[PDB]
Amino acid sequence: GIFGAIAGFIEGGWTGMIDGWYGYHHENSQGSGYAADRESTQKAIDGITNKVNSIINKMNTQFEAVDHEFSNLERRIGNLNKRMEDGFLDVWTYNAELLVLLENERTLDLHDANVKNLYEKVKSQLRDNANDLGNGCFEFWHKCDNECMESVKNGTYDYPKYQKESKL
């Protein structure tokens, strides 16, 4: 998907994660479940919202056709008016249609990037204390209780504290 994560070396999304756009699935002895990363979710919501509103705002003018009549001795100005009106119509149709195609492409890339960046921040904490697996999951070489999980998510993991158990 450009950053390579969404559909994906992370093949498939999670219907079970309902509280945000990106985040984490964990499983340990104390149970399993989904939790959204709220900081990167909200930041993306603000970004996309701002995008939508900027497009709306910048497309907030209208060309206005008129329905003036023209006699049979005004074929040239009548046709000039027709060509001008269809002129602006075709310009605005193109601008709207293309903008949507382009922004849609980029909006999917942005989501892809955000997933990828989560993945990389976790990878950087865990090192060899977990095995990658290359599908977005990390099998720990040690035992990771719930505040060990919460530790990974909040960006405070303490590699050394489990470095020993992981070697063995």
């Binding site: 699935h25 497309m59 907030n60 099998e139």
Partner: protein, 325 residues
């Protein structure tokens, strides 16, 4: 073994968008920017109702075709609705000069007050009481004439003398008015109605002058008539005066309209849609749009505040992610 994964939301959405690289991508959230729904009616705008011309065209209404009496008098409107099959316009054959500019002038207005500009007594030594024709019936009388004009003919026992009228616009509003010049089919009719001699119609203002003479000829019959009238219009600005002078062939102004030009864009809609008692902020030729959206594919013709018109079927913007459940 303990596990933690990175991933992304999925859901039950089947809604799709297109991108430059791919068509029909299902996404978790999206927003449609285009409106394609309308109420198929005409509503009030800025709380003013539209004017329904019913069975009259603009020409019939404004000249006072006798079959257009239900429109007679003062009118206020937010826009005008002219029905495509309207039958009552110009009854006595001829051309309304600068017709398209007249239509454009009236469409830029919001109110008219009808008033008597030249009472029949203005014109001395002529007959102001026939001037009635079968080309131009009422619903109740088979031989009549426009309600805003007077077809003057000579009295039976005298020549048609020079006649004169004057009107000083002392108000603050411009006045829209009309006149005509009768063009008989032959010399016999010219002589019956106006007597012999070179005839003229002259009209004048501080800023316009008009001069015309009859052009006698037998033209193909229309509503029974091989004669014609040339109809005219002008606008008497505040502080201006109009002098009328003729010795024959004058279709004289009688009633005219104090005219108020609107504050924004005016419209004349040619449509069969019904008018109802409803308010609106956006009225297109083909219906009202009640929408917050930024685009619409309903119609390029409207008044009020409408979304931009485009030819698209849909303009759906992705907000969420590719849906992979």
């Amino acid at each position: 073994s303990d596990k933690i994964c990175i991933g992304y939301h999925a859901n039950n959405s089947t809604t799709q968008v297109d991108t430059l690289l791919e068509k029909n991508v299902t996404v978790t959230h999206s927003v449609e920017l285009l409106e394609n729904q309308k109420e198929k009616r005409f509503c009030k705008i800025m709380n003013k109702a539209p004017l329904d011309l019913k069975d009259c065209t603009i020409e019939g209404w404004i000249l006072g075709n006798p079959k257009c009496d239900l429109l007679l008098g003062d009118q206020s409107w937010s826009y005008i609705v002219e029905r495509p099959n309207a039958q009552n316009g110009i009854c006595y054959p001829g051309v309304l000069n600068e017709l398209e500019e007249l239509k454009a002038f009236i469409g830029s207005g919001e109110r008219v007050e009808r008033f008597e500009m030249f009472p029949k007594s203005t014109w001395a030594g002529v007959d102001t009481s026939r001037g009635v024709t079968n080309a131009c019936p009422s619903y109740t009388i088979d031989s009549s004439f426009y309600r805003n004009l007077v077809w003057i003919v000579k009295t039976d026992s005298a020549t048609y003398p020079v006649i004169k009228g004057t009107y000083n616009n002392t108000g603050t509003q411009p006045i829209l008015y009309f006149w005509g010049v009768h063009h008989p089919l032959d010399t016999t009719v010219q002589d019956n109605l106006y007597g012999s001699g070179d005839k003229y119609v002259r009209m004048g203002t501080e800023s316009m002058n008009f001069a015309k003479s009859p052009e006698i000829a037998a033209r193909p019959a229309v509503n029974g008539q091989r004669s014609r009238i040339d109809y005219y219009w002008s606008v008497l600005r505040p502080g201006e005066t109009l002098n009328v002078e003729s010795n024959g062939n004058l279709i004289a102004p009688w009633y005219a309209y104090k005219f108020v030009s609107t504050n924004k864009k005016g419209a004349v809609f040619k449509s069969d849609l019904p008018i109802e008692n409803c308010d609106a902020t956006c009225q297109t030729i083909t219906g009202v749009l009640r929408t917050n959206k930024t685009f619409q594919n309903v119609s390029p013709l409207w008044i009020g505040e409408c979304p931009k018109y485009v030819k698209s079927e849909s303009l759906r913007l992705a907000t969420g992610l590719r849906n992979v459940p």
